[PDB]
Design a protein around this ligand. Structure first.
Ligand SMILES: O=c1[nH]cnc2c1oc1ccccc12
Ligand SMILES: O=c1[nH]cnc2c1oc1ccccc12
Lengths: 265, 264
């Protein structure tokens, strides 16, 4: 992996692994999301982070995901080389955005694109806050100044408001718990695990006859290591659309809400 | 990755990923086991198994894991390059063995080693079988003829008999279920998931103050996509544990194992 010529974006190539593919012998959406996370981390390392800046570590502040949106046109086959380009952009005092473009290394064609919204949070109190001027100046030297968006369209799916699923759900997967492989180096549940949990309530027949085209996921609250989650899905629709909800099994506290779009194979 | 000069073994380099490491910022044993599985698949592809042979496909036969044994001296740090060398060997009519050596790419030192025993099984009836002469002949052209073992020591840990844990267990993690990420391309539970499930019943204080040195795992029966598993552990002692995975309902054994941990 390496920063591009202008140093305002980062590229990395990955060879799709045998354990990373599903029944179609192509990468799962969770493998894609793990690769996006990996190239994001390698971008942050290449410009001097550890994604906390000097001022963020001084004030016990971190970046947390608020939303992840992914659109896949072609999932890379086992043994294929996929090239991912990533960049960051400041969105004023609201937060930051990380975008990705996925390409087939052999053809050079765009096979996927993703965008994520990040908010500032105090590590200890867990209180969200706006971005300060000092933090904005610190990361503007690593971001393109003119807008560069993976989803530029006028009324694009990445910015749509997602409603709350009403009980009873059409489908459900109950009692989901994270194991040690689901945790990151800081012992927090990996963001990709939540995508897997959302997909658990999609019926097997949809997975067997459809390919996932779009997934938009809102992150409201974290799942702790000893928490238990319920995954809920309701069909909202050639294409199939679903409305999703992750909540704690006990009190029913919302942790995530989302939507998926699937196309018939 | 590539086959070595003599074509009797295969080497591949891997850069340890951010999501592949634990709290110590080094690779987890599950990341290591996934890498061993990946280099094993790439070895099989390089010698034309695109690991069923021509005779095995005609006879509806497959190789299934009976035992996995792994010993780690140093877990590679995040960003490090680890080089893994793998080879296969026929063990007469019993089955086959796949061995691995893990090295630090920078120093060239051995940081780990692993060995696995594979048995022949009919994919439909699930009945274990001895290896036929035609299959053994087809495998011998890709395996070293003289013995080459990752664990050569006479009377070593990789071949020890493992006893069955007696109830009550000291520790337990109940109601474990596989999700779609736990399945392979054939919709069967990945062998590495069982290692994670065994480790779930180890208390957090052991994980926080010790590093896993050795894991020996016996595979008795498969966990189906809709099965639920209970993970049981009892201290037998360095810290040593005896492990058991069984179905939550009838208590049918799926795995048994042992782990050895060193104080950090
Ligand atoms: O270390 C953390 N403190 C507080 N909140 C979080 C921390 O790591 C996270 C990872 C994902 C989401 C929230 C958090
Ligand atoms: O296709 C299979 N049939 C029967 N037993 C197994 C099959 O795939 C497996 C993968 C791992 C372990 C057992 C099996």
């Amino acid at each position: 992996g390496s920063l591009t010529e202008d140093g305002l974006s980062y590229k990395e190539k990955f060879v799709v692994r045998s354990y990373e593919v599903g029944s179609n012998k192509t990468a799962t959406v969770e493998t894609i999301a793990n690769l996006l996370q990996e190239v994001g981390c390698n971008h942050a390392q290449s410009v001097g982070f550890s994604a906390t800046t000097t001022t963020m570590r001084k004030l016990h502040l971190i970046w947390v995901t608020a939303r992840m949106h992914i659109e896949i046109y072609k999932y890379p086959a086992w043994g294929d080389v996929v090239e991912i380009e990533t960049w960051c952009q400041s969105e004023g005092r609201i937060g930051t955005r990380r975008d990705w473009i996925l390409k087939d290394s052999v053809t050079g064609e765009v096979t996927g694109r993703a965008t994520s919204k990040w908010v500032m949070m105090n590590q200890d109190t867990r209180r969200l806050q706006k971005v300060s001027d000092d933090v904005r100046d610190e990361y503007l030297v690593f971001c393109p100044q003119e807008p560069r968006l993976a989803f530029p369209e006028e009324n694009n799916r990445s910015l749509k408001k997602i409603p709350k699923l009403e009980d009873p759900a059409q489908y459900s997967m109950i009692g989901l718990k994270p194991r040690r492989a689901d945790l990151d180096m800081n012992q927090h549940v990996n963001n990709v695990t939540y995508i897997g949990w959302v997909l658990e309530s999609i019926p097997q027949e949809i997975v067997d006859t459809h390919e996932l085209q779009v997934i938009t996921l809102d992150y409201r609250r974290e799942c702790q290591q000893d928490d238990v989650v319920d995954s809920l899905t309701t069909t909202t629709s050639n294409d199939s659309q679903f409305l999703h909800l992750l909540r704690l099994s006990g009190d029913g506290q919302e942790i995530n809400r989302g939507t998926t779009l699937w196309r018939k194979k």
